[PDB]
Amino acid sequence: GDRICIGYHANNSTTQVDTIMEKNVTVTHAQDILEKEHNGRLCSLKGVKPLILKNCSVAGWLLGNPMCDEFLNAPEWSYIVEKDRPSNGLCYPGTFNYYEELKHLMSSTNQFEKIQIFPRSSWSNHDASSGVSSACPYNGRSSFFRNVVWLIKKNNVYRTITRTYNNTNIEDLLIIWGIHHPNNAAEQIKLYQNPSTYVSVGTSTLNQRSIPEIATRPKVNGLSGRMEFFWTILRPNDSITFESTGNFIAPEYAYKIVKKGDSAIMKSELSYSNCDTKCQTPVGAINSSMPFHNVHPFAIGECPKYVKLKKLVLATGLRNIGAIAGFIEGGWQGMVDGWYGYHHSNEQGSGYAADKESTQKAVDGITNKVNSIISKMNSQFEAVGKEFNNLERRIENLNKKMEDGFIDVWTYNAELLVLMENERTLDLHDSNVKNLYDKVRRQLRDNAKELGNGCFEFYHRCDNKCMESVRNGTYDYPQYSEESRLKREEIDSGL
Amino acid sequence: GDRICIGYHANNSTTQVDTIMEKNVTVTHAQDILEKEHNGRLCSLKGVKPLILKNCSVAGWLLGNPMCDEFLNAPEWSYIVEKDRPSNGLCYPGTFNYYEELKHLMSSTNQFEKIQIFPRSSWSNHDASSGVSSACPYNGRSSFFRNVVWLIKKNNVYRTITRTYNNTNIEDLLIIWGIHHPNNAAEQIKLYQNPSTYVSVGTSTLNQRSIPEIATRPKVNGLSGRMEFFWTILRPNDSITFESTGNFIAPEYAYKIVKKGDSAIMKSELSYSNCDTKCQTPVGAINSSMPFHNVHPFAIGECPKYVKLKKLVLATGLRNIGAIAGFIEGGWQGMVDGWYGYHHSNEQGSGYAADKESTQKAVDGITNKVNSIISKMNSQFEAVGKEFNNLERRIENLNKKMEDGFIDVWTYNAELLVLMENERTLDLHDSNVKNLYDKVRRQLRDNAKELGNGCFEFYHRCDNKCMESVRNGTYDYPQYSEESRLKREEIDSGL
Amino acid sequence: GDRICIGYHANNSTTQVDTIMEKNVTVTHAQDILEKEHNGRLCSLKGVKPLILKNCSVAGWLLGNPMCDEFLNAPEWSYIVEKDRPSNGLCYPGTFNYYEELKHLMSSTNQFEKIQIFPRSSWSNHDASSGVSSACPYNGRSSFFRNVVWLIKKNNVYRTITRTYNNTNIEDLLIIWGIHHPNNAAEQIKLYQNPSTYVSVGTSTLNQRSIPEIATRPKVNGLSGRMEFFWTILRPNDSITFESTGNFIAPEYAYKIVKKGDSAIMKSELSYSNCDTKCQTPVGAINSSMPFHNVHPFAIGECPKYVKLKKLVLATGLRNIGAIAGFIEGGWQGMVDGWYGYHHSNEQGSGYAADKESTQKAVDGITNKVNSIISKMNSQFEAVGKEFNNLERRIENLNKKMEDGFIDVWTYNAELLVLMENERTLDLHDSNVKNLYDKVRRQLRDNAKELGNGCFEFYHRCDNKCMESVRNGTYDYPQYSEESRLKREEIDSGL
Numbered sequence A, B, C: 001g002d003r004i005c006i007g008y009h010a011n012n013s014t015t016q017v018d019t020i021m022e023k024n025v026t027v028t029h030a031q032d033i034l035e036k037e038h039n040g041r042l043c044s045l046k047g048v049k050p051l052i053l054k055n056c057s058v059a060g061w062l063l064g065n066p067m068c069d070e071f072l073n074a075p076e077w078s079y080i081v082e083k084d085r086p087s088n089g090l091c092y093p094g095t096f097n098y099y100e101e102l103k104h105l106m107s108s109t110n111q112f113e114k115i116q117i118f119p120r121s122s123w124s125n126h127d128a129s130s131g132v133s134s135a136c137p138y139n140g141r142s143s144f145f146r147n148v149v150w151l152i153k154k155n156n157v158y159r160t161i162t163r164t165y166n167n168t169n170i171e172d173l174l175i176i177w178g179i180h181h182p183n184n185a186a187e188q189i190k191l192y193q194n195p196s197t198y199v200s201v202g203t204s205t206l207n208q209r210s211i212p213e214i215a216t217r218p219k220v221n222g223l224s225g226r227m228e229f230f231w232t233i234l235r236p237n238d239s240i241t242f243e244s245t246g247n248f249i250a251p252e253y254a255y256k257i258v259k260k261g262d263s264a265i266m267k268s269e270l271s272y273s274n275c276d277t278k279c280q281t282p283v284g285a286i287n288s289s290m291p292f293h294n295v296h297p298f299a300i301g302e303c304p305k306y307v308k309l310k311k312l313v314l315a316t317g318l319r320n321i322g323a324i325a326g327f328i329e330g331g332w333q334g335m336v337d338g339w340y341g342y343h344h345s346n347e348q349g350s351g352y353a354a355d356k357e358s359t360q361k362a363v364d365g366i367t368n369k370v371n372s373i374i375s376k377m378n379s380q381f382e383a384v385g386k387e388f389n390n391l392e393r394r395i396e397n398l399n400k401k402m403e404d405g406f407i408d409v410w411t412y413n414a415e416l417l418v419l420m421e422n423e424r425t426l427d428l429h430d431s432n433v434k435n436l437y438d439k440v441r442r443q444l445r446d447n448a449k450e451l452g453n454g455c456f457e458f459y460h461r462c463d464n465k466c467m468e469s470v471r472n473g474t475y476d477y478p479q480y481s482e483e484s485r486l487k488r489e490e491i492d493s494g495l
């Protein structure tokens, strides 16, 4: 009898972690940091709803394709949702110049207010009602974009248009207009009389003379003609003047840019639900509590950092071991209120007290090290949506290689940090356990025999209140020295 | 007499590794992971040959510059090889719009099939044979691009061309055409009669009216005129219509895009050899076995990861030490079948048995850690060729800074990983050796005296079959205890 | 009496470092590596002065806006300084095509030489003196750009200009010209007679016919007309020919590109001082001695690496502890000439000698590890200035995300390296101190009793010259063995 052992926690845990050195290492306590689920729904972002475009493209929305919903309420939005291949775009076919740049403006815009700048009924000298088409059906009747006017010769005459608008608002105006490219020389005269026309636009920054480019083209949405749209931002206190002799697709409504901020165009097929989120991906929203996730790289909102991993587990406690007779052989299920501690084995005692002078000192630096790991990726790369046209494949690939490149870099960093500090965490517990034993051996010097399994046997009587002499860094050699003095030479001369 | 020692491997090795802390550290076993050689040849990639362009540029190939080889076999290719400054390009001088975007399409294309869409002899109303030039010699005779037709007025008349082609194939078609920019007003009439002309092209996506831009220009390849080429991809089931009144350089042959995939345009001066490779760089092919290389950043194929380093050596075993009398003084050349082990020194024995309970346990986690290091760069950045024109210097520099930037990042990572796990590898062996000694000291407790050099001397007789009691974690103190009991007090009372 | 202790340095230091595990760790010796100050001045770079543009933009400089200084001395420069919103640019309003590409050329250019190519007085057939404007005041009198000529009809006639210049210099020429866009059809005739005009330019690489685009525009700097400028680089031995029938803004002076190299356009509001620097940022110059800084990301010159951190401190020495009686309890202020060492306590002695066999061996690998850390970021990312126009927002954001992305990556690396090697540095000292004790215990074996506080008490007389037996790895057990032999059994039988 008369012993004492140094030992460590063990429990029912089957959590597993990895290191540089080993895989699947069972530990007492561990912390998952990777989010892997989403809810498959499309939600408001912290109370603010997305602008859902349904089957419409940004072009169809902005020009007012009759199949598309106008937003009369002038709502603000958190993000914009556009399907992958929207069916309602330029119902009258053609091109929309610097479309992808316009879409990129929307990513920093959170609210429009449509304002009328040239009322449809202010074109005295021209036909403002015949410009409609079977390609733009509203309720099965031929119609046209709601926000631009297809002006047409009146009484076989098309008087020169010169018309100006002064931006007397505080806000930038987004202004859109267009030009008609007819099918042949006869069509041009039929519509606009004058055989050779132009559309001239002028601001303090933009000077442009546009000219109708006639070609023989195959039918799109039934039509061989085309229309080409343009856009500009008219700054506060600047003015814009249009002059045309024909083919002018004139603006009616402009868009006051009333709120700039963090926004996005998300490409998703989902539809909106009664749902709110902190973090939205194109395939569903995420419970943003953990610091990493692998759901989708184009997450927006207050999001965890995206990494290309199947798992990310930080070790926090000891390995999980029976585990009998001191630390050399494993950990104690019997120890409950601590990670490292002791075992009494007394004339009075049984054992299993915990040393929380070093248990708390370890729970201190572990939970401090954990938060440090997470916050070290506070500035981790976050991907940003952009689109490119079919003649911008190089910069599109540049952009892909950059974003994938940063995701790979940070994936690597996140993994390496976890593996490396995991090895350091497990190694710390080892050194803490080995430190505990040494604290005791440096106290009980001669008065006890090292048993080689993690326990000491006393060459003297100790009793319970000396069993905290040893725990409290207080045991004094002298006051038990003379008793030990004698009993060990009794061993040296016993049987 | 009566001893036993704890010791470690040593051998003839002069392999050297580095750590954060020290350079040039001699070790027992080490693993080079950096490829530094190439074969200076240009090879097929895994059985598939490159498309070698010789002295021709992609433009010269595609338009059929008479000096360039057509590939009648419609071969597939693994990569394309273009010299740095090819001598055969636009033999008739001019410009090729969105050339760099076209070249970027080739990087995802692996096979063309040339098809005739407008046969050269189908231009009834025009001269399809006089459009040839001293600038385009075929066998010293004046000639012209093989795949486009320089249509010319017939009988002093040039009737309006309107001509259509429907893509009734499964595959995308690459279609090229052009327009002639004459030298002066008289030249225009001499060639095309009609003083004011255009070239109009129309598909469902492309609308274009082109106009001849006359200027007085210095001679290139002898000529002051210029020709400007265009290209489009005509989707399956779409049609393309051309209309011109003059200056039309019409297409004859289009290119069926029959195989898309991983390809590249490599800028190299080398010529092809009977040679196959897994990994090709512009200065030679590489033996893709090691995980890193430093030959060239624009390697393609199944390649090691490129890093800007002169060396990369992983330590696998112990440092390399004579080295006498236990681990405190160095390693044993005498130990051969293990990294750590013992030395007998018995009434019967000599020594040098190896502890492979911990040798194999170390060879386990070292070879497992090695593979983990390599696979951690599986997603390392790989550079991708692209070209830019002289008005795209900003995005060209963006692209350079990005690729060099990622190469630097991964160079850093690769080096830091090797140095850091090298320090961890050497430190592991130390702790393994120190662990071995402790296993023995915790067994032989009182029965032996620690000699302070890594060896124990027995206070009792052991014999050979107890010398595996100690090796096998099986030695029991008690069955030799009473013999030791007596002999140590004989030391305490000897001479 | 009769003792000896193993101990470590301690001193007056209050330097603090951090690790992964702990913050604010007081150490004996530490090395700041982060530069955080600048001098708020704009300096020459290593003897070479910046080209200070004052209130002028690159356009105003190059065209010779009468408000801008010409640099008649043809100076070379280290960088160019442009204010954020320069007030003197196109005094006659309009556009400058591929302006941002031109600015990017300046970033690789270090010296121009202005040369006259078409002398202002060589335009016999035209009015070379009436083209001046109230928008371009020189000394309150109407004037015009100094380097281009606004040619005007002479005697109500404007004869066709055809004019050529051959670049017979070694150097590339930067050549600028322009075209006038009038306000209305009457203005065109008033100025250039001929109602329909063009400006044609031709080199071996550039073919261009420019056409005047009339529009009704609001007044900028008082004027509603606009002028559009163009530029090209004319290679040595190439020639450029201009032809116009009106609206030609002709070149007078071209710029010989005489020195290429490392340069930059810095956006700064500062003005130049009698000051020289190695490293210049837009808000001030930096004392480039330390390896990192956080002053500004757009630093140029021979600069430390920019990181987004408030502090970066490498630990070099031990933690800073009174600290009595051996290493178990803290470090010795009393030890002065070393980091680790001993304490005598002799019949003759007091103590405090330093073990510089391991002190120098640690100062060796610490100062070697430090330099290794710095040089590992030799290839760290460095940001590069570029500008983008209002239709290049996507590539501008691409460029921002790339540069911020690399700065974040390297910020992370720098921090992680310091924290991790800091933990390794502190841990090294611990292991060095623990190694010292063990060197002594493996010598003095039986002859001394381990006191458990870091000190040994001798069972024999040692004297001073044996106190270096112990320090010099030379103490021999035998020559004191028989004396110890007896005195310990006197303890075993004392009182």
Ligand SMILES: *[C@@H]1O[C@H](CO)[C@@H](O)[C@H](O)[C@H]1NC(C)=O
Pocket (backbone or CB within 6 Å): A054, A055, A087, A271
């Ligand atoms: C979009 O079009 C689909 C056809 O695929 C139609 O069934 C559906 O009603 C439309 N969705 C919305 C949200 O309007």
Ligand SMILES: *[C@@H]1O[C@H](CO)[C@@H](O)[C@H](O)[C@H]1NC(C)=O
Pocket (backbone or CB within 6 Å): B054, B055, B087, B271
């Ligand atoms: C390319 O041109 C060179 C002239 O530098 C000529 O000698 C050689 O035959 C050509 N090479 C090939 C592969 O046709």
Ligand SMILES: *[C@@H]1O[C@H](CO)[C@@H](O)[C@H](O)[C@H]1NC(C)=O
Pocket (backbone or CB within 6 Å): C054, C055, C087, C271
């Ligand atoms: C620039 O213009 C300012 C007006 O803000 C004027 O006061 C100053 O003299 C000018 N600075 C220089 C360096 O010419």
